[PDB]
Amino acid sequence: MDEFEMIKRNTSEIISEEELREVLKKDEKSARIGFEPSGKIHLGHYLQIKKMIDLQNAGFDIIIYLADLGAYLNQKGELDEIRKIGDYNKKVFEAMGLKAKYVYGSENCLDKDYTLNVYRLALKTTLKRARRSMELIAREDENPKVAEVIYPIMQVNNIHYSGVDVAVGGMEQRKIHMLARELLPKKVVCIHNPVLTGLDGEGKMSSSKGNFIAVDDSPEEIRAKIKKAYCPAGVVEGNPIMEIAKYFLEYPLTIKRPEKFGGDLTVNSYEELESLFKNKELHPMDLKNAVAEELIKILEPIRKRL
Amino acid sequence: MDEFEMIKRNTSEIISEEELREVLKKDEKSARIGFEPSGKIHLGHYLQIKKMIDLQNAGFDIIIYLADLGAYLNQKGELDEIRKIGDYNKKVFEAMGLKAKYVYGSENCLDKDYTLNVYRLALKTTLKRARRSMELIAREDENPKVAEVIYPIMQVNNIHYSGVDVAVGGMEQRKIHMLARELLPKKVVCIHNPVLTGLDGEGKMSSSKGNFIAVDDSPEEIRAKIKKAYCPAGVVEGNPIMEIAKYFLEYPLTIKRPEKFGGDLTVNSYEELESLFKNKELHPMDLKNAVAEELIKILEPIRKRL
Numbered sequence: 058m059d060e061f062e063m064i065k066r067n068t069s070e071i072i073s074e075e076e077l078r079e080v081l082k083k084d085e086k087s088a089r090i091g092f093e094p095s096g097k098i099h100l101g102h103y104l105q106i107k108k109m110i111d112l113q114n115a116g117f118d119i120i121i122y123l124a125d126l127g128a129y130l131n132q133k134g135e136l137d138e139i140r141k142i143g144d145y146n147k148k149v150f151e152a153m154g155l156k157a158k159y160v161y162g163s164e165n166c167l168d169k170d171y172t173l174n175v176y177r178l179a180l181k182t183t184l185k186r187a188r189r190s191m192e193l194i195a196r197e198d199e200n201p202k203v204a205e206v207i208y209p210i211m212q213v214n215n216i217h218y219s220g221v222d223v224a225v226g227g228m229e230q231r232k233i234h235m236l237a238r239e240l241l242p243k244k245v246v247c248i249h250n251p252v253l254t255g256l257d258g259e260g261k262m263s264s265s266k267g268n269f270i271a272v273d274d275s276p277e278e279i280r281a282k283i284k285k286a287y288c289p290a291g292v293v294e295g296n297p298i299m300e301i302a303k304y305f306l307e308y309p310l311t312i313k314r315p316e317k318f319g320g321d322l323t324v325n326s327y328e329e330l331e332s333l334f335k336n337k338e339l340h341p342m343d344l345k346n347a348v349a350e351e352l353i354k355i356l357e358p359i360r361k362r363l
Numbered sequence: 364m365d366e367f368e369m370i371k372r373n374t375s376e377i378i379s380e381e382e383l384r385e386v387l388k389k390d391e392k393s394a395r396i397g398f399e400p401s402g403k404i405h406l407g408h409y410l411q412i413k414k415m416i417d418l419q420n421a422g423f424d425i426i427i428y429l430a431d432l433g434a435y436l437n438q439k440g441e442l443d444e445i446r447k448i449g450d451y452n453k454k455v456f457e458a459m460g461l462k463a464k465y466v467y468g469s470e471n472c473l474d475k476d477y478t479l480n481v482y483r484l485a486l487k488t489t490l491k492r493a494r495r496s497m498e499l500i501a502r503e504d505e506n507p508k509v510a511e512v513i514y515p516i517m518q519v520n521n522i523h524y525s526g527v528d529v530a531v532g533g534m535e536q537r538k539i540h541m542l543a544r545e546l547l548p549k550k551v552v553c554i555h556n557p558v559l560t561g562l563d564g565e566g567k568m569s570s571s572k573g574n575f576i577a578v579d580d581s582p583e584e585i586r587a588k589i590k591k592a593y594c595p596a597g598v599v600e601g602n603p604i605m606e607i608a609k610y611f612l613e614y615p616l617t618i619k620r621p622e623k624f625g626g627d628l629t630v631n632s633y634e635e636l637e638s639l640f641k642n643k644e645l646h647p648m649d650l651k652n653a654v655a656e657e658l659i660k661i662l663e664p665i666r667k668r669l
């Protein structure tokens with residue numbers, strides 16, 4: 058493989074690839090991702106963390122930003138409560154096997170120079186640019202608040218003050234990151250990960266919704282959720298089960314089936330699993346049973362360490 | 364004339380009158396007005412300052428806030444440049460015969476608690492409410508910035524941290540002040556002054572529209588500006604000359620005219636001057652000559668002290 062290829066693996070985009078290669082030449086390099094503290098930690102978080110681990114193995118210093126102020130501005134609750142949730146998320150990230158630097162937003166000093174730079178960034182960012190960047194991030198509100206447009210300019214300001222070389226996040230974070238690449242003196246290389254489809258096949262997998270597989274879910278809960286999940290035969294696009302098998306399952310994979318239904322099946326890659334599912338040679342239920350058991354094995358050490 | 368009446372004199376509105384009377388009972392009371400630093404100090408500023416003087420005589424502790432940060436957010440230029448202009452405005456305010464405490468926006472540090480309260484104010488203020496409050500204040504821009512909606516919540520936060528009892532400003536500040544009266548624990552009494560019409564009879568009198576009469580303008584410049592000013596016969600509304608005579612001129616007033624045009628005329632109140640002008644008994648030219656010479660007398664000590 059390669060350090061570049063390992064990092065690029067299972068990503069939606071890299072901004073840009075040539076900039077990434079120029080960063081890999083450095084001996085000291087840092088990558089930073091920020092999370093709004095979530096009550097439950099699902100696969101959507103795990104995918105990001107796994108990518109941060111890939112960067113860690115490449116020689117990057119990993120920084121995990123617990124955006125408690127961001128969640129506060131995004132109408133998620135009270136500061137100290139979000140702080141508590143952030144602490145729980147840190148322990149979960151540790152249980153995933155990621156040893157990194159965990160920084161809260163509660164500190165942040167918020168000195169004169171920080172707020173001054175916020176004003177300077179707010180002076181160069183239009184309201185329409187700021188709102189568009191918050192479309193996939195801002196909590197649904199009939200009446201958008203002023204805090205909604207303070208959110209993205211702070212995330213840009215945080216990228217600047219961290220001085221990191223690489224910024225990581227979901228595809229929902231791209232518009233903010235591109236805005237950060239335009240205003241800031243030092244252009245950060247953005248690595249955006251795919252957005253996981255919810256179990257019901259409607260909308261993204263979020264903690265605020267009821268379509269997630271938490272990393273600490275019981276094996277019975279995992280089996281039930283996967284079983285009830287949206288998974289039409291032949292359709293790969295928008296299929297969460299196919300997504301989980303693509304981003305989490307380890308290959309070569311053996312699918313257990315009764316002899317009456319074709320017997321056990323062994324695939325060597327996701328592409329083979331994808332082809333077998335496209336031509337409907339594999340039934341969704343057998344796919345679900347395979348993915349469920351493998352997901353249980355994978356999430357088990359994390360479940361045990363909590 | 365009561366202290367209440369003396370304060371209410373030549374105001375547009377007071378929010379509210381009963382709240383004002385409850386403040387007048389206190390031995391220690393404060394009134395605060397904020398100005399975006401302007402290159403030239405015009406009659407609009409003088410009207411505000413005169414009202415601050417009325418409050419000073421009423422027993423109020425006067426605070427002038429030089430909003431250099433506000434102007435910075437409103438796209439007026441660079442901080443240090445705005446600060447310089449702010450200093451010049453302080454000297455002009457002193458020359459007006461107003462001794463008070465002058466506070467800059469850049470000196471008042473942006474500690475964690477300040478920015479934190481800004482976040483909470485932004486969390487309770489909609490984008491639509493914030494923009495509507497900036498309609499008569501914000502610099503004209505085809506592409507409104509995020510800084511535009513940080514402006515009004517800061518002005519609200521400033522009223523809170525100052526702890527003043529009475530807030531003073533033009534009618535353009537009312538939507539911000541009423542927003543401040545809604546969100547803040549302590550409800551401040553708002554005294555709003557009328558908006559002076561420009562010399563061309565179009566739009567408000569501003570330093571950026573060139574329809575103003577600076578307090579340090581030369582007598583020849585004042586005579587010229589008054590002479591070319593919009594002043595149709597019979598029309599009192601939207602007439603800058605009538606406005607100047609109403610808010611600045613001292614009565615009883617004697618209007619000097621040649622015997623061929625009716626000879627010298629002596630009015631005792633603005634109401635009589637208004638009635639004489641409505642019935643076209645007084646020609647606009649004679650009004651202009653009267654207003655000009657009196658304004659020159661009034662502004663003379665100010666110009667000399669500069």
Ligand SMILES: N[C@@H](Cc1cc(F)c(O)c(F)c1)C(=O)O
Pocket residue numbers: 089090091092093122124127194208211212213215216230
């Ligand atoms: N926008 C991120 C949270 C976040 C991450 C950051 F790196 C960040 O700097 C920030 F202010 C907020 C999210 O959607 O969770």
Ligand SMILES: N[C@@H](Cc1cc(F)c(O)c(F)c1)C(=O)O
Pocket residue numbers: 395396397398399428430433500514517518519521522536
């Ligand atoms: N709104 C004022 C400037 C100003 C006054 C204040 F009192 C104030 O607190 C502020 F932040 C800005 C103006 O338009 O001049």
